[PDB]
C-alpha cells in the first residue's frame, strides 16, 4: 500500500474496471486530472473519493496554475488569474503583491481540496523572457521576484494543507528544445528561485530541454541537472516529478518504459504519463526500476495535510471570502 513510481490518469468521470486495475497495479503512485475529469464538483469529488478507495496511498494532482492553465474553471470554481498578473501587481504595489499572491494560493488550493485532489503542478518558476508556450505563465522577469511571489503564493497554498511543485527546472523561460547558455548564466538566474526557495519548495517538475553546455541528456533525464545541481548544489529534498513523458520528442526515439527508467535513474521519484492510460500501463508491466523507500518517504510528503472544508462550508468561510474580496480588489 506504498505508492508507485508511476503517475498516469484514468478513463473519464468515473472509474472503470480498466481504470481500477491500473489503480492497484504496485508501480502506479498517482493520477494527474484533466478538463476530461470535470463535469461538476459532485462528480469530480465523487471521481477522487473512488481513486483513493482503489488506492488509499494515491497522490491526485492536477495543473492548476491560473490563466491559461486551469483544468477547472467552472460550477463554482474560481477562475484565477495568469501568474504574470502577480508581476504586474508587484511592480506598482510589492507588499499587495505577496498578500494577493497568498491569496490566490489559498483559493487554489482549498477549492481543488474541497474536491479531494492533494496538489496543482504549480507554481511556474520560468523567468518571463519573452516562448509562446510558457508566456503570461510566468511571473516575472526578475528572478527574486518570481521567488518572492511564488514564495507567497505556496504559502498559500500551504494554509489548505497544500504542497507545491516548481517547474521547470532549472529554466524553461529561455525533436527537444535546446538551451546553448553556460552552467553560470543558467545558475544565476534561472535556477536562483529554486535555491532562494528553501523549505517554501516541495517538489520540482525538470524541463525536457537539452542544456547543450552542461548536458547531453534533457534535465528530466539529466544525472547532472537532478543529482548533482539540484538534490547536490541546491541540497533540494522535495519530490521531482518528470514532466508528461507522453511527449514524442521525450522518448528519444524509445519506448515509454526506457524514457520512464531513465527518468527515475536520473533522479526522478515519479514519471507522468498522461493521455494514454493503456500505454501508461505497458509501463506500469515493463518497468525495471521499483519505488525506493527514499522516494516514497518523499513522494507521501506530497499528500494534501489536515481535513479540508466541504465546499458548502467553503464558500461561506470568513477566510475565503477575504481572499476573494482581496483578489477582486486588486486584479
Ligand atoms: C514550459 C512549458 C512546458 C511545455 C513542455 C509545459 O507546459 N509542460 C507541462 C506539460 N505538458 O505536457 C505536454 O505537453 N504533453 C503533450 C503535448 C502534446 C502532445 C502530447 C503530449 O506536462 C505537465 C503535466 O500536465 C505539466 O505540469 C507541465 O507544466
Redesign the pocket.
Same mark, same amino acid.
Given at each position: 500500500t506504498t505508492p508507485g513510481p508511476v503517475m498516469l490518469d484514468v478513463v473519464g468521470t468515473t472509474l472503470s474496471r480498466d481504470d481500477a486495475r491500473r489503480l492497484a497495479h504496485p508501480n502506479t503512485g498517482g493520477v494527474?486530472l484533466?478538463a476530461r475529469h470535470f463535469q461538476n464538483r459532485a462528480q469530480l469529488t465523487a471521481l477522487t473519493d473512488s481513486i483513493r478507495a482503489v488506492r488509499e496511498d494515491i497522490l491526485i494532482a492536477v495543473?492548476h496554475?491560473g490563466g491559461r +492553465?486551469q483544468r477547472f474553471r467552472t460550477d463554482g470554481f474560481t477562475v484565477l488569474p495568469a501568474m504574470r498578473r502577480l508581476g504586474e501587481l508587484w511592480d506598482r504595489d510589492v507588499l499587495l503583491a505577496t498578500k494577493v499572491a497568498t491569496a490566490v494560493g489559498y483559493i487554489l488550493a482549498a477549492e481543488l481540496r474541497a474536491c479531494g485532489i492533494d496538489m496543482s503542478?504549480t507554481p +511556474?518558476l520560468?523567468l518571463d523572457y519573452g516562448?509562446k +508556450?510558457?508566456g503570461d505563465?510566468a511571473f516575472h522577469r526578475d528572478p527574486r521576484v518570481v521567488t518572492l511571489l511564488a514564495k507567497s503564493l505556496n504559502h498559500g497554498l500551504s494554509l489548505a494543507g497544500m504542497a507545491n511543485?516548481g517547474?521547470?527546472f532549472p529554466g524553461?523561460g529561455f525533436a527537444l528544445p535546446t538551451d546553448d547558455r553556460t552552467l553560470d548564466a543558467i545558475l544565476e538566474q534561472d535556477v536562483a528561485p529554486y535555491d532562494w526557495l528553501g523549505l517554501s519548495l516541495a517538489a520540482v517538475?525538470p524541463?525536457?530541454v537539452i542544456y547543450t553546455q552542461v548536458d547531453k541528456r534533457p534535465a528530466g533525464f539529466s544525472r547532472v541537472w537532478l543529482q548533482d545541481i539540484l538534490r547536490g548544489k541546491l541540497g533540494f529534498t522535495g519530490a521531482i516529478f518528470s514532466?508528461?513523458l507522453?511527449?514524442?520528442a521525450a522518448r528519444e526515439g524509445g519506448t515509454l518504459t526506457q524514457a520512464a527508467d531513465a527518468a527515475l535513474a536520473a533522479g526522478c521519484d515519479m514519471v507522468?504519463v498522461?493521455?494514454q492510460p493503456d500505454a501508461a500501463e505497458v509501463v506500469l508491466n515493463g518497468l525495471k526500476a521499483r519505488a525506493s523507500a527514499e522516494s516514497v518517504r518523499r513522494i507521501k510528503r506530497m499528500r494534501a495535510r489536515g481535513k479540508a472544508l466541504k465546499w458548502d462550508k467553503l464558500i461561506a468561510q470568513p477566510e475565503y471570502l477575504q481572499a476573494q474580496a482581496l483578489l477582486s480588489s486588486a486584479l
Open positions: 494527474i484533466f495543473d496554475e +492553465v503542478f +511556474v520560468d516562448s +508556450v510558457i505563465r511543485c517547474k521547470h524553461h517538475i524541463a525536457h514532466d508528461d507522453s511527449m514524442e507522468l498522461c493521455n
